[PDB]
Design a protein around this ligand. Structure first.
Ligand SMILES: *[C@@H]1O[C@H](CO)[C@@H](O[C@@H]2O[C@H](CO)[C@@H](O)[C@H](O)[C@H]2NC(C)=O)[C@H](O[C@@H]2O[C@@H](C)[C@@H](O)[C@@H](O)[C@@H]2O)[C@H]1NC(C)=O
Ligand SMILES: *[C@@H]1O[C@H](CO)[C@@H](O[C@@H]2O[C@H](CO)[C@@H](O)[C@H](O)[C@H]2NC(C)=O)[C@H](O[C@@H]2O[C@@H](C)[C@@H](O)[C@@H](O)[C@@H]2O)[C@H]1NC(C)=O
Ligand SMILES: *[C@@H]1O[C@H](CO)[C@@H](O[C@@H]2O[C@H](CO)[C@@H](O)[C@H](O)[C@H]2NC(C)=O)[C@H](O)[C@H]1NC(C)=O
Ligand SMILES: CC(=O)N[C@@H]1[C@@H](O)[C@@H](O)[C@@H](CO)O[C@@H]1O
Ligand SMILES: CC(=O)N[C@@H]1[C@@H](O)[C@@H](O)[C@@H](CO)O[C@@H]1O
Ligand SMILES: *[C@@H]1O[C@H](CO)[C@@H](O)[C@H](O)[C@H]1NC(C)=O
Length: 257
């Protein structure tokens, strides 16, 4: 009834108990991923998440409160229970606040903040601490392709040799240009028909995505899903749109060699 994994988030860095100290109150931070014990988190059926025999703990339950390691028995019960929603958040049920990395840098200290569905609030519980590299196959068995910073994404015939068809699926729930990992698939607004482009990763809600069980790629803040505009690949426009279940909104990841 328990299992142990890393937790990968912002910029592909991992949740790390700072300096590897286990004394009560030691902050959680981002640090490059590894196998050290202070990055190994055990998920127990009691909804605790433990490292080095101690619990991930909200040191307070307010906007901006720090998350620390603390003795599981002596901490407040409200402070040591967590849930891992399917969209990749890590939520403290008592407060409703979510784990947030407010900066991308190593040594950034993790905070509970109001959920805004930001990419800074996306996490992946996994033993593979590298981004998964895949083509994103969609409408007409075509492949999603990048076309540079600030430009639209669009569909093209799948080519094993097209680097701009290769996507790094990061633990913070961002979809990144594999060959330029500072750049993120980004919706240019949260309204229906807003265009999906490539922009510098800035941890924004516009840069967060969820691969749901229906084959959709969902932007959690807007609720909207990636859509090949008008089922017309020649428009070279991918938008966000309400989920319809139609072929122009169905996507599969295909892992690359
Ligand atoms: C919870 O904490 C967040 C980080 O402190 C707040 O965002 C920050 O709000 C500051 C003004 O209080 C502003 O100068 C900062 O730029 C901003 N930081 C970022 C990165 O957004 C947040 O406050 C809400 O959202 C901001 C953008 C403003 O609209 C505030 O008026 C809001 O209160 C805090 N959230 C809440 C609901 O308290
Ligand atoms: C969490 O805090 C508990 C209360 O301070 C620790 O249990 C206490 O450990 C003392 C020193 O080891 C021991 O004298 C006390 O009998 C015991 N108190 C109680 C109420 O059990 C606990 O330490 C862990 O569990 C105890 C029982 C021993 O097995 C320790 O060796 C364990 O470290 C603290 N937990 C951790 C992980 O530090
Ligand atoms: C995706 O991009 C990554 C990062 O640039 C590429 O990975 C590098 O590949 C070279 C050659 O194999 C290795 O020597 C490095 O160790 C890799 N870097 C990292 C950080 O993993 C990768 O080849 C790209 N393409 C695919 C399909 O993954
Ligand atoms: C093994 C070990 O304790 N490693 C930690 C690492 O996980 C990180 O916490 C870093 C900076 O705070 O301090 C050490 O290098
Ligand atoms: C079935 C079909 O092509 N639906 C598309 C829809 O998915 C979206 O792209 C919209 C934008 O105006 O255009 C059409 O309704
Ligand atoms: C698809 O888009 C292209 C390019 O803009 C346009 O020329 C064409 O007529 C469109 N096809 C349909 C069926 O609307």
């Amino acid at each position: 009834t328990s299992f142990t994994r890393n937790i990968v988030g912002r910029d592909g860095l991992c949740v790390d108990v700072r300096n590897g100290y286990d004394t009560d109150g030691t902050p959680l931070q981002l640090w490059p991923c590894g196998t050290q014990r202070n990055q190994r988190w055990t998920f127990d059926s009691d909804d605790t998440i433990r490292s080095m025999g101690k619990c991930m703990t909200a040191n307070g339950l307010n906007n901006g409160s720090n998350i620390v390691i603390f003795n599981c028995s002596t901490a407040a019960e409200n402070a040591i229970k967590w849930e891992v929603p399917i969209d990749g958040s890590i939520i403290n049920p008592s407060s409703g606040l979510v784990m947030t990395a407010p900066r991308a840098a190593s040594r950034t200290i993790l905070l509970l903040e109001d959920n805004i569905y930001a990419a800074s609030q996306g996490w992946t519980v996994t033993n593979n601490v590298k981004p998964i590299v895949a083509s994103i196959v969609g409408y007409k068995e075509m492949c999603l392709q990048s076309n540079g910073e600030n430009n639209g994404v669009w569909m093209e015939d799948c080519e094993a040799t097209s680097l701009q068809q290769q996507w790094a699926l990061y633990g913070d729930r961002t979809i990144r240009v594999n060959s330029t990992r500072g750049l993120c698939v980004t919706t240019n607004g949260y309204n229906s028909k807003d265009l999906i482009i490539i922009l510098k990763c800035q941890g924004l809600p516009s840069q967060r995505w969820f691969f749901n069980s229906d084959g959709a790629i969902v932007n959690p803040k807007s609720r909207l899903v990636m859509d090949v505009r008008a089922s017309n690949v020649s428009l070279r426009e991918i938008i966000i749109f309400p989920a319809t279940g139609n072929p122009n909104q169905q996507w599969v990841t295909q892992v690359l060699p």
